Symmetry: C2
Subunit: 146 residues, 2 copies
């Protein structure tokens, strides 16, 4: 999607832990956190953080049941977020890409969470020809003036 | 400072917990996390996250001993961050402002960390006449083209 307020949120499992990954659909920019286990409360907390940093309008997921909890609904209500009911998705390979980079760097760090943030850094800085990190700020900045 | 790669990191204490606050000096934009206690490892981890998201060149603090740990030095080395040896600071009132907003919203949430992220959201979205959230993306976007 071209729309700059659209994010996708999904969890992946690795080493008995959970990685919550948010992808800015228009740019391919990622933010991630390692959490103990998938819970509504953790998703809610993550969304509050994301919304305070970026202009989040709509969120999508590959697992709709992710957003059924009261806590998630509360966070979306307060921050003014809707569920995205478009996207009938390059975000699959985006997540597998991340899991690849994590694999490449994993032995360099003790903790998974360290490897994850290393992988997010690599992903967001990598040039394509701008990086995801540059594309997100450009898209959002532009949209402010539009 | 006008320089867009400059951040200030400090911890504040509230309810027996620690709030790590990063301020983008040029814009006044904030990111924050609640941690159990001040440790080098938590500061290091926080820096890795910050660096993966923004083009962080130099970091300053009001407590220099914050950055003596091996873990912090490792994170700064890997992410290519230097200590800022300028700034001989509106960032004091910036932190007290945040603690004020937290006070205003605190009773609305069970957890301190929820109130903190609520306060970060409010701070970053508030118009001055742009918000901190808009100023950071503008400053960074502009600097990409310069
Ligand atoms: C524990 C809880 N339990 C809950 C139980 C039911 C519904 C919401 C929560 C909420 C809640 C969720 C999202 C919000 C809230 C806000 C104010 C108060 N509570 C919440 C504004 C920002 O978004 C919460 C909050 O905790 C988490 C964010 C970790 C889930 C809270 O600290 O009150
Ligand atoms: C536990 C530790 N213990 C340490 C002890 C001494 C020095 C560094 C650490 C480091 C370390 C710190 C920063 C880094 C690292 C990198 C690779 C490997 N280790 C680290 C690249 C990114 O920045 C770390 C890392 O853990 C924290 C980030 C929670 C401190 C790690 O998981 O290896």
């Amino acid at each position: 999607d071209c729309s700059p307020g659209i994010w996708q949120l999904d969890c992946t499992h690795l080493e008995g832990k959970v990685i919550l990954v948010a992808v800015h659909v228009a740019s391919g920019y990622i933010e991630a956190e390692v959490i103990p286990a998938e819970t509504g409360q953790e998703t809610a907390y993550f969304l509050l953080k994301l919304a305070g940093r970026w202009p989040v309008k709509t969120v999508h997921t590959d697992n709709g049941s992710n957003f059924t909890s009261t806590t998630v609904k509360a966070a979306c209500w307060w921050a003014g977020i809707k569920q995205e009911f478009g996207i009938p998705g390059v975000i699959e390979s985006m997540n597998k890409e991340l899991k690849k980079i994590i694999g490449q760097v994993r032995d360099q760090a003790e903790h998974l969470k360290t490897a994850v943030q290393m992988a997010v850094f690599i992903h967001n800085k990598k040039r394509k020809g701008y990086s995801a990190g540059e594309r997100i700020v450009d898209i959002i900045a532009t949209d402010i003036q539009t």
